[PDB]
Amino acid sequence: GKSYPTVSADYQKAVEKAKKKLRGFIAEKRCAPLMLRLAWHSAGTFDKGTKTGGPFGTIKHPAELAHSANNGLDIAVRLLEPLKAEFPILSYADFYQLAGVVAVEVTGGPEVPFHPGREDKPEPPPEGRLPDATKGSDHLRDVFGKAMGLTDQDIVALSGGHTIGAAHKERSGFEGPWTSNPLIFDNSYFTELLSGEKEGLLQLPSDKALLSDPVFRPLVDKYAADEDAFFADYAEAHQKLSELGFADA
Ligand code: HEM
Ligand SMILES: [K+]
């Protein structure tokens, strides 16, 4: 149900040039996981029933950055501002989602389709809509399904974004990477989840909830066995996430 807006030729040219500059910048700074978390936290506030929140540029506002869920994301916003300023025609909304898409690509993930046109909105959404790492499946469905409107399949594939990156005790309070290759986008998140607790590697209660839910567990198993299946479902879910509320909800 998407109808993407028309943008001018100059806008499309800047998207293409921004995409290339973002690859070099994100690869150089080794910040792909942080930029994916910035894109996701930008989009993950969407509430379908009210059409509030979502990927509309509000996370750079200090009021949204101050949310505890966003601890550390001010680094990301600061890191991107010089590059953003080279593309004044792009919305911050599109810029941050483009950074998320590129973060996945440059770590070796699928190519997530990207459509421009998001407008920057003035009001951040209320705090408290992003998922709580200490809760379980019922909570995940409340947040991804009843608020955002995404599917159970989308929940498991998007959880796989933890295949890159790490937690930090001074940000969430959790600490360490989910995988042994945290700058490589692959299905290792699911293979670690299945294998048990390995020393040095992180599992949140929200990751573990995937193993005991009757719908989520068959997906974890599919993704652990079939990385190509993981990439297809990942790319579908990330595109949907990045487009919540945009070009028809
Ligand atoms: C399923 C519900 C989820 C919960 C409860 C959750 C929770 C967390 C927490 C607590 C952290 C650690 C932050 C820190 O201390 O630095 C984290 C990091 C991260 N999250 Fe999630 N997350 C969820 C879903 C997602 C999704 C849907 C994506 C994107 C597809 C994503 C991508 C990441 C990435 C890449 C990091 C690493 C950031 C870094 O390395 O700095 N997560 N998440
Ligand atoms: K990995």
The CATH number covering residue 220 comes to 1.10.420.10
Three-state DSSP class for residue 237: helix
Q: Is 34 annotated as a binding residue?
A: yes
Asked if 147 and 25 sit in the same domain, the reply is: no
Please give the single-letter amino acid code of residue 139. H
Instruction: Assess whether the C-beta atom of 11 lies below 6 angstroms from ligand 1.
Output: no
Q: Which residues of 193-229 are buried (b: 16+ CB within 10 A; e: fewer)?
A: beeeeeeebbbbebbebbeebeebbebbebbbeebee
Neighbours of ion ligand 2 (CB under 5 A): 163, 179, 181, 184, 186, 188
- Asked if residue 233 and residue 120 are part of one domain, the reply reads no
Mutate to test the pocket of ligand 1, among 150, 162, 181, 231 (most ligand atoms within 8 A of CB): 162
| Same domain flag for 163 and 184 | yes
Contact status, residue 174 vs residue 25, Cβ threshold 8 Å:
no
d(CA 54, CA 35): 16
7 contact partners, CB below 8 Å, separation of at least 6 = 116, 117
User: What does this entry list as its resolution, in Å?
Assistant: 1.6
Structure-token pair, residue 239: 């595109």
Experimental method: X-ray
Total domains present in the chain: 2
Best residue among 26, 31, 34, 37 to mutate for probing ligand 1, ranked by most atoms within 8 Å of CB: 37
Please return the burial class of 172, using the count of CB atoms within 10 Å of its CB with bins 0-12, 13-18 and 19+: middle
Please indicate, yes or no, whether residues 126 and 243 belong to a single structural domain of this protein: yes
124 plus 200 within the same structural domain: no
Check if the beta carbon of residue 156 is closer than 8 Å to that of residue 230.
Answer: no
Active site residue 139: no
Q: Which domain holds residue 169?
A: 131-237
Residue 29 is labelled as binding a ligand = yes
Contacts of 131 (CB under 8 A, 6+ apart): 44, 139, 140, 143, 144, 206
Structural tokens at position 166: 């790490």
Q: Which helix (H) or strand (E) holds 62?
A: helix 62-65
166 in a labelled binding site: yes
* Continuous H helices in 107-176: 137-140, 152-159
Dig out the tokens for 90 from the structure: 């792009």
Handedness of CA 53, 58, 62, 68 (dihedral sign): positive
Q: How far is CA 10 from the centre of its chain?
A: 27
Residue nearest to atom 31 of ligand 1 (CA): 161
For 218, the token pair is 């068959």
The residue to which tokens 């599992």 are assigned:
203
The residue whose two tokens read 């890159």 is: 164
Question: What is the Å distance from ligand 2's center to 28 Cα?
Answer: 18
Phi-psi category of residue 203: left, alpha or beta, with phi > 0 → left and psi -120 to 50 → alpha: beta
Closest listed residue to residue 165, CA positions, set 154, 176, 155, 156: 176
* Any atom of ligand 1 within 6 Å of the Cβ of 39: no
Amino acid letter, residue 119: E
- Is 179 found in the same domain as 222? yes
For the record, the structure tokens of 161 come out as 């974004």
Q: 60 and 121 share a domain? A: yes
Q: Which atom of ligand 1 sits closest to the CA of residue 206?
A: 5
Distance CA 208, CA 196 (A): 10
Nearest ligand atom owner, CA of 178: 2
Give the bridge partners for 239, in sequence order.
none
Q: Helix, strand, or coil here: 23?
A: helix
Residues 61 and 101 in one domain: yes
Whether 249 and 230 map to the same domain: the answer is no
Residue 39's domain is classified under what CATH number?
A: 1.10.520.10
Same domain, 231 and 249: no
Query: Does any ligand 1 atom lie closer than 6 A to the CB of residue 72?
Result: yes
* Burial call 1-39: b when 16+ CB within 10 Å, e when fewer: eeeeeebeeebeebbeebeeebbebbbeeebbbbbbbbb
> Are 212 and 233 contained in the same domain?
yes
